[PDB]
């Protein structure tokens, strides 16, 4: 019932294979219907099929001829059907198959050799079936198989007598999760021709049983091992012992309630490159806990440590030098924890660390000092995240060790202080500083004089004060390109605040009180603080209380692409106020008191616009006031979202719900 070289007939209550469709289709989705059998005759005309998805039906068995009728079929999906008896003929003629999907069919056992014919098959999925064993054949077959999926079955042993039918196969993925294994009988993994990835997640295993598995994995091509939610209560120098004789490069131990990590627990993994330890209950990370992991370049310790119970030093504890062995560690994540604080050698020895995320990693980092991040002095850290740590004061030279740091996020903290500008000393290559969402930030003229390379500076909702200095606090930032000064109730801006920032591209000033500075009656004249901003592309002035616009505030912004002044009190605008906005592609006056979209004002702006939004306005349905706008609406190609429902006329009394586009 839907087609574009792909016949989508999904969810149509179909009890019959459509004979309507064109005979040149190559994909046929028949999922979620009441089909109970696929007689090969009804597939004779659809011979060009390469994908046949017929999941979610009442199909009981397949006649052999079905395959003969589709000799190009490469993807067959019979998942979530009643297909529970497999014979030697069910797939015998489906030879060009590369994916066979047989999930959720109450398949309790497999008899002889259903798959011996599928020599091209790459992926076999038999998950969510009552399979009590991995026996799929009585001979070596499926040498081209790469993905064997048997998760979510009743399989409780791995025996070489059943997996050696893969002795010519190189399995990239052997998914055995959510199975209740209790024994890894000897040789079982060397049975497979090559075993690259093994997945045992939600497999209730335990520390001693896990030890055996690794011994069985010894001398295998294993590269990916995933023991997530394995109930690994603890580890020991003995656990991953067999992994000594592997080149394993990925290990997942997340969601294990991992309580104690013995020393050298992971000493046997010198080729490991990716370590996923998140979501555990580690009590104490001793010195030698991570000894040996000298090739790991990505560690993840998110929520890895225990949570503060009632505080009687129920906090975690990370001894110094605990990371000194990870020499290649490029990317460390420790976010969402209760580490009490940064000790003087916490991060010592991480000579390749580039990205470190410490978001909410701590109980509280109350004060950053010139001692705090000293252990990082010898790493090339480029990105440092310190959000959600209740940081309250930053002192001089606090980041002096982070020489090559480029991005620094201090947002979502409780920082209340005066930025003397000493703080940023040392930051020689800094490009972004996020200070949004803090308690109080009081500016000086040198608040950023030590960081001229700065390109992004975010000051959202910090009750900013002293932005109105004689040379603005931002004057030394001559390559600033994004400045966010929103939600600061800024009532006084000086004329020359953005002077010098010739490169400024995005300026967010929404939710301030700088409304009177553009009234004609301002003591001294309106403040033209946007002058000289050639490269400005985005300007957001929402919720500022504006109700006048001076005729030439936007006179220099020729590259302005998005202008955003809604949720103001604007009713009438000076004619030719938008004249110089030639690249303007998005104009927004969404909630204002506008009644009169006159051509003399909006003409040049509307000229070429990608999108316009001036909804919810008290439009006056009179020719002098709305007429030319209505014509432009019916004519223009610029799209006007919610046009017929949220552009409503309010005057005169006789036109009140009339959507403005109808007269």
């Amino acid at each position: 019932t839907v087609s574009h070289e792909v016949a989508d007939c999904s969810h149509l209550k179909l009890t019959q294979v459509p004979d309507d469709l064109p005979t040149n289709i190559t994909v046929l989705n028949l999922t979620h219907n009441q089909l109970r059998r696929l007689p090969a005759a009804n597939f004779t005309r659809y011979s060009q099929l390469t994908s046949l998805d017929v999941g979610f039906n009442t199909i009981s068995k397949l006649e052999p001829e079905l395959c003969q009728k589709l000799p190009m079929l490469k993807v067959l999906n019979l998942q979530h059907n009643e297909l529970s008896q497999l014979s030697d003929k069910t797939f015998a003629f489906c030879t060009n198959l590369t994916e066979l999907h047989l999930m959720s069919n109450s398949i309790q056992k497999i008899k002889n050799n259903p798959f011996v014919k599928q020599k091209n098959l790459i992926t076999l999925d038999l998950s969510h079936n009552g399979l009590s064993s991995t026996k799929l054949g009585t001979q070596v077959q499926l040498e081209n198989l790469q993905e064997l999926l048997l998760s979510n079955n009743k399989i409780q042993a791995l025996k070489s007598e059943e997996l050696d039918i893969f002795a010519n196969s190189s399995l990239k993925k052997l998914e055995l999760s959510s199975n209740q294994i209790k024994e890894f009988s000897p040789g079982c993994f060397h049975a497979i021709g090559r075993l690259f990835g093994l997945f045992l997640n939600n497999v209730q295993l335990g520390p001693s049983l896990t030890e055996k598995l690794c011994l069985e994995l010894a001398n295998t091509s294993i590269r990916n091992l995933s023991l997530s939610n394995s109930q690994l209560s603890t580890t020991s120098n003995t656990t991953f012992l067999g992994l000594k004789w592997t080149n394993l490069t990925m290990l997942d131990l997340s969601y294990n309630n991992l309580n104690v990590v013995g020393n050298d627990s992971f000493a046997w993994l010198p080729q490991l490159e990716y370590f996923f330890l998140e979501y555990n209950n580690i009590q104490h990370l001793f010195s030698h806990s991570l000894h040996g992991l000298f090739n790991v370049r990505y560690l993840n310790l998110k929520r890895s440590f225990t949570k503060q119970s009632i505080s009687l030093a129920s906090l975690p504890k990370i001894d110094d030098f605990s990371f000194q062995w990870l020499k290649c560690l490029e990317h460390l994540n420790m976010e969402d924890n209760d580490i009490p604080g940064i000790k003087s050698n916490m991060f010592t020895g991480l000579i390749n660390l580039k990205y470190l995320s410490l978001s909410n990693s701590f109980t509280s980092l109350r004060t950053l000092t010139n001692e705090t991040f000293v252990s990082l002095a010898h790493s090339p850290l480029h990105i440092l995240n310190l959000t959600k740590n209740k940081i309250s004061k930053i002192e001089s030279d606090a980041f002096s060790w982070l020489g090559h740091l480029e991005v620094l996020d201090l947002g979502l903290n409780e920082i209340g202080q005066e930025l003397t500008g000493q703080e940023w000393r040392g930051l020689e290559n800094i490009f972004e500083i996020y200070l949004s969402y803090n308690k109080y930030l009081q500016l000086t003229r040198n608040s950023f004089a030590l960081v001229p390379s700065l390109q992004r500076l975010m000051l959202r909702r910090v009750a900013l004060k002293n932005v109105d200095s004689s040379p603005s606090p931002f004057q030394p930032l001559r390559n600033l390109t994004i400045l966010d000064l929103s939600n600061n109730n800024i009532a006084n801006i000086n004329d020359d605040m953005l002077e010098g920032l010739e490169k400024l591209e995005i300026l967010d000033l929404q939710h301030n009180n700088l409304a009177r500075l553009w009234k004609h009656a301002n003591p001294g004249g309106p403040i033209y603080f946007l002058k000289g901003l050639s490269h400005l592309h985005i300007l957001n002035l929402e919720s500022n209380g504006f109700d006048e616009i001076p005729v030439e505030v936007f006179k220099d912004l020729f590259e302005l692409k998005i202008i955003d002044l809604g949720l103001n009190n604007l009713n009438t605008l000076p004619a030719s106020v938008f004249n110089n906005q030639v690249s303007l592609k998005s104009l927004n006056l969404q909630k204002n008191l506008i009644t009169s979209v006159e051509k003399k004002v909006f003409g040049p702006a509307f000229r070429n616009l990608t999108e316009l939004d001036m909804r919810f306005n008290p439009f006056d349905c009179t020719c002098e006031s709305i007429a030319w706008f209505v014509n432009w609406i019916n004519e223009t190609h610029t799209n006007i979202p919610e046009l017929s429902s949220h552009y409503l006329c309010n005057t005169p009394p006789h036109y009140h719900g009339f959507p403005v586009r109808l007269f």
């Epitope: 002889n112 001979q139 040789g187």
Partner: antibody
């Protein structure tokens, strides 16, 4: 071409052990694409199955129930031949014995042995 | 399980067509083989995987497998074709299952 050649005592006394030998030529016993076994035929036409051996990572041998306690088939790579043995034979075991090459996928028997009559009589 | 069952005897006038049937609960779900055994001789595979012959078996021999019956068909019967015929398949414990055999007679 491949061909199977039996050899062994055709007179065996009761309670004793029947022992035969299939000698292959034109094919390896350790080869893939096939398994090796035995088929017995009592003179009253009954053509019945005994057991087979086959190799995947190791050698496995699946015998028929009814001889599952007496039969022993196993290969001999050094000579390229496999063997049949039955212990405590009764006169019921008097029959014609064929060695056989079952071939994969579905265990069809392309090539048979010449047959060797073995009689269990005192 | 699976129990192959074929007729005791069948005769054929030489030159005519012989068919020997092999019934069984869902035999169509299996691949069937056919063995020809002449008096005092090891059998010979004539049809395997139930449909096409091996190398050197003549084209006169042919088989099918549908529903609950599988048939070996021998067009243009010659005098030599007089033999016993067995159908076979394999189920997991027993790697060869045999029918009763059919004794084919020719004038």
């Amino acid at each position: 071409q491949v061909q199977l050649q039996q050899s062994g005592p055709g007179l065996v006394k009761p309670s004793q052990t029947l022992s035969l030998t299939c000698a292959i030529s034109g094919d390896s016993v350790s080869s893939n694409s096939a398994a090796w076994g035995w088929i017995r035929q009592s003179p009253g036409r009954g053509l019945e199955w005994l057991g087979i051996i086959q190799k995947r990572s190791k050698w496995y041998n699946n015998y028929a129930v009814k001889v599952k306690s007496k039969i022993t088939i196993n290969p001999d790579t050094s000579k390229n031949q496999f063997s049949l043995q039955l212990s405590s034979v009764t006169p019921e075991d008097t029959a014609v014995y064929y060695c056989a090459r079952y071939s994969y996928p579905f265990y069809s028997i392309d090539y048979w042995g010449q047959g060797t009559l073995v009689t269990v009589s005192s | 399980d699976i129990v192959l069952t074929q007729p005791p005897s069948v005769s054929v006038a030489p030159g005519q067509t012989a068919r020997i049937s092999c019934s069984g609960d869902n035999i169509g779900s299996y691949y069937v083989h056919w063995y020809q055994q002449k008096p005092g001789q090891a059998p010979v595979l004539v049809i395997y995987e139930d449909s096409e012959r091996p190398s050197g078996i003549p084209e006169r021999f042919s088989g099918s497998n549908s529903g609950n019956t599988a048939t070996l068909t021998i067009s243009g019967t010659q005098a030599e074709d007089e033999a016993d015929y067995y159908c076979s398949s394999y189920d997991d414990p027993n790697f060869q299952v045999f029918g009763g055999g059919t004794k084919l007679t020719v004038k």
